A paper describes a structure:
Therapeutic antibodies directed against either programmed cell death-1 protein (PD-1) or its ligand PD-L1 have demonstrated efficacy in the treatment of various cancers. Herein, we show a group of “nonsymmetric” compounds that bind to PD-L1 and are based on an amide linker attached to a biphenyl structure. A series of nonsymmetric C2 inhibitors were synthesized and evaluated for PD-1/PD-L1 interaction inhibition. These compounds induced PD-L1 dimerization and effectively blocked PD-L1/PD-1 interaction in a homogeneous time-resolved fluorescence (HTRF) assay with most inhibitors exhibiting IC50 values in the single-digit nM range and below. Structural insight into how these inhibitors interact with PD-L1 was gained by using NMR and X-ray cocrystal structure studies.
Author numbering:
A (entry chain B): 4 to 121
B (entry chain A): 3 to 122
Write the structure that this text describes.
């Protein structure tokens, strides 16, 4: 069965940093953009939806409007990498990545945001 | 205008020992395309039913749903992922999640309340 993996299920990040969280999925041979859906959400907020070789942007939640991107390059390696830029305490929580690619799976990732220090 | 899953009810109140059928609707424009369809039902991370590419998996199905859960295949052609659990117990109360991939993808949550058995 098709299986998604996370290198870490817990990220501890510093306030104001950039954060990149990752879900790995098998790509034998080359990538097939037509068969690939990748969705990231937190607490039911639509962060990034990549459906059929393209991101949506319309249904993306306002709080992630110019902050979240999927690293397109990484998709060909079988890596759904979410970058959130300028991490705030509101970004602490449980992230869910959902992948459909000849099979489907999802995984949960917890983010702790430590308070501003640096 | 993205693909959207709907639930006619997001809360089922069921009697102890009854059968329960919970439903997620998804658009089927023309005929059904079994090759492109994934339907997954889970509760509290337990694999209830996984329908991948015109067939159920059954290897990965959780032990506590082994002879109790089935997807009503007939209903799929109408755009209805219908999960039947037979002989509902109090352990079946909780939050159910159906996940559908068919052209696009969506999921919905359903809460099940199981009322207690009578002394009748
Ligand atoms: C729903 C979804 C999306 N979501 C959206 O795009 C979306 C979703 C929601 C919205 C927002 N709309 C508003 C809603 O309120 C807006 N876009 C994206 C991609 C795929 C899916 C989807 C589809 C169908 C089925 C499944 N799941 C499964 O089939 C599944 C999952 C998990 C496990 C368990 N296994 C664990 C590993 C062990 N592995 S082992 C033993 O070695 O076998 C098993 N099977 C998923 C994840």
């Amino acid at each position: 069965a098709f299986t998604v993996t996370v290198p870490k299920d817990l990220y501890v990040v510093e306030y104001g940093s950039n954060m990149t969280i990752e879900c790995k999925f098998p790509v034998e041979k080359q990538l097939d953009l037509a068969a690939l859906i990748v969705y990231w959400e937190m607490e039911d907020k639509n962060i990034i939806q990549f459906v059929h070789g393209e991101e949506d942007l319309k249904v993306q939640h306002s709080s992630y409007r110019q902050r979240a991107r999927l690293l397109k390059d990484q998709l060909s390696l079988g890596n759904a990498a979410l970058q959130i830029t300028d991490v705030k305490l509101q970004d602490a929580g449980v992230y869910r990545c959902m992948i459909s690619y000849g099979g489907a799976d999802y995984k949960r990732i917890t983010v702790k945001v430590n308070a501003p220090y640096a």
